[PDB]
Amino acid sequence: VVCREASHAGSWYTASGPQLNAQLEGWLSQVQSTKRPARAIIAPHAGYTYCGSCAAHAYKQVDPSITRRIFILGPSHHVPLSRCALSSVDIYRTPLYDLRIDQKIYGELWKTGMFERMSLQTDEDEHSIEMHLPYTAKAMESHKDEFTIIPVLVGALSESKEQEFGKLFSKYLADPSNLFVVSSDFCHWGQRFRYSYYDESQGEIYRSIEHLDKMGMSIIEQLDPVSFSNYLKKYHNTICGRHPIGVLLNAITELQKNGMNMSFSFLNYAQSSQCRNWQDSSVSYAAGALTVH
Ligand SMILES: [Cu+]
């Protein structure tokens, strides 16, 4: 058709509009805005019942009176993708209100030939982008009729491809009217994820997970894509949105080469549970914001 349905409403977040509106409002109430206006954010894409309050720390930094085009870069979980993919529909539906895809930017991005066209089934099967639509619509409701979205599915990008896509999106990141939402959870720890790296010097397992995550968070705060690449090559932390992050980090360094000065700061860290023994498992969530100066 012409609309991507809220395919994960009911399961990953409440399908009731009034209830969803109230939940996001409540999570956003407990956050004080400190990084307005955010040029980019990093936010988790798990179920709202796990990461809702954490993701609110990122969306409170969005200034709806400034932002007009919202890029959402999410990792692919079901489709083999070596590049980036664009949607084939024109509207993304949410229980709050439906979001419009910026046709001008979609034509510019498609005309590069670096992007693939993802089918409607692939679109609705994926959740890494959709989990940010209700939060985006809520934070932008004061200007609900003046903003568009640019969905981008990010595949298994090579380091060179992360740099190429980063330089491409850098021209859009430099626009003050643009916002880049980078979707990622952090450490998936446990036997279910086949990842059990544990540094006993850090104490308990959940403290080792915390130290491992915040090492990667600090590198992001240093805006260093090469150090982030090495950190992933050294510890193999199960950060599922590492490719969108690497794309953003390269976009920042391309802007730094052109005189622009920026600062990224993480604002909330959380874990779905606190692992203490080898039979435990947890997923970490981190919310951060990028500000341009
Ligand atoms: Cu994930």
Author numbering: 5 to 297
Sentences from the paper on this structure:
To reveal the binding mode of each metal, we have crystallized MEMO1 in the presence of iron or copper under the conditions similar to those used previously for solving the structure of the metal-free protein. To prevent metal oxidation, MEMO1 crystallization with iron (II) or copper (I) was set up in an anaerobic chamber and the plates were incubated under argon, while the crystals were growing. When MEMO1 was crystallized in the presence of copper, the copper atom bound at the same site, and was coordinated by the same residues as iron. The protein fold of both metal-bound forms of MEMO1 is essentially identical to the metal-free structure, with RMSD for α-carbons of the superimposed structures being less than 0.17 Å. In the absence of iron, we have also observed binding of copper (added as Cu(I)) to MEMO1 at a molar ratio of copper to protein of approximately 0.4. Copper (I) binding was also detected by ITC, with an estimated Kd of about 3×10–6 M. Thus, metal coordination in MEMO1 is achieved by H49, H81, and C244, while H192 and D189 do not participate in metal binding in MEMO1. Therefore, in the absence of specific copper loading mechanisms for MEMO1, it is likely to predominantly bind iron in the cytosol of the living cells, even though copper binding can be observed in vitro. Still, consistent with the previous reports, MEMO1 may bind copper under oxidative conditions in a specific local environment within the cell, and it is tempting to speculate that metal-binding change may trigger a switch between different MEMO1 activities in the cell.
